[PDB]
Design a protein around this ligand. Sequence first.
Ligand SMILES: Cc1noc2c1[C@@H](O)[C@@]13CNC[C@@H]1C[C@@H]2N3C
Ligand SMILES: [Cl-]
Ligand SMILES: [Cl-]
Ligand SMILES: [Cl-]
Ligand SMILES: [Cl-]
Ligand SMILES: [Cl-]
Ligand SMILES: [Mg+2]
Length: 348
Amino acid sequence: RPTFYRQELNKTIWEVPERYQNLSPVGSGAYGSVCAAFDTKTGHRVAVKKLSRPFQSIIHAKRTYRELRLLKHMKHENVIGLLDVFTPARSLEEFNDVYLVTHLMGADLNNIVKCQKLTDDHVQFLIYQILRGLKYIHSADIIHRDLKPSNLAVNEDCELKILDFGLARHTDDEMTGYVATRWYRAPEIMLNWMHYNQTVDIWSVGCIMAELLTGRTLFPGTDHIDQLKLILRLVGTPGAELLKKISSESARNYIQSLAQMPKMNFANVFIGANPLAVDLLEKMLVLDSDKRITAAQALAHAYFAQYHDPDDEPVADPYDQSFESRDLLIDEWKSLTYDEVISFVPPP
Ligand SMILES: Cc1noc2c1[C@@H](O)[C@@]13CNC[C@@H]1C[C@@H]2N3C
Ligand SMILES: [Cl-]
Ligand SMILES: [Cl-]
Ligand SMILES: [Cl-]
Ligand SMILES: [Cl-]
Ligand SMILES: [Cl-]
Ligand SMILES: [Mg+2]
């Protein structure tokens, strides 16, 4: 067991191993508080996240277990990994606090799209890396569910990492009105049309790629219905085949109220873009999720000829998510979480 030291940082007691020095507050969601620190064992600048009220309800206890299982599994160059996890508790009986340690991220894709001029070459390399990371995530039957520019961190070398997996339901309030939290979501999840699957992440990659090419949000809706009208004007209204797959009867009735519209010419929307970029956008931004290109298929598209190497695009170890359908008490979720904290082995 390492030695721990205590300090108060913005009304919060932090108790951390001595290896972690120069703690400085960076942020706080409602899931926890984050400090930047210097890790003296590795020489990395790190983010240390202290979870807030990790075991306060069955829903919160299970979310804590879900987040730790997911971060422990992810071992890929284009995905955030877990550097460390610790608790100052010396037994299960006194276990209350969980701390997670990752690489400290500088810029996100939002910073570079807003404030920098991107060549077609830059767009090929950035989208290539998102798809390499998604081939790995999807091979484990994991869905990210929240891909957007603020969840895609990049370093000076142009090396991209996916972070901030969707691990809890968003609040109705967070998805309401003129907000980036909804602009990247597939229409089947935004309007609860049907059981969704990993195809929702490829819709989000199409939206991000379009914004790198134009410098503008593709579907900046003022609310759910405005955003659906923006989407159907580009891709066309649904045919009989997709309407049959909308399990929601009222959602089907509303769609049929709208005047029919054909798919637009994407060469006339993305004026001057590489024709191979236009072709790949037409294969991602398909309204029927069964017909979208997959991450593995997209990696072999001619747009990525400069970067594609089928011997250096790895898949994940199998991932057991049977816990997701299990009904347990708070103390059972807390015991499962304690076992995952004490069994952690750091990367090489
Ligand atoms: C950080 C950062 N800020 O500006 C840049 C970066 C790098 O990620 C990048 C690599 N390729 C796209 C980016 C544009 C520019 N640089 C050439
Ligand atoms: Cl230490
Ligand atoms: Cl990492
Ligand atoms: Cl504790
Ligand atoms: Cl964003
Ligand atoms: Cl597993
Ligand atoms: Mg985020």
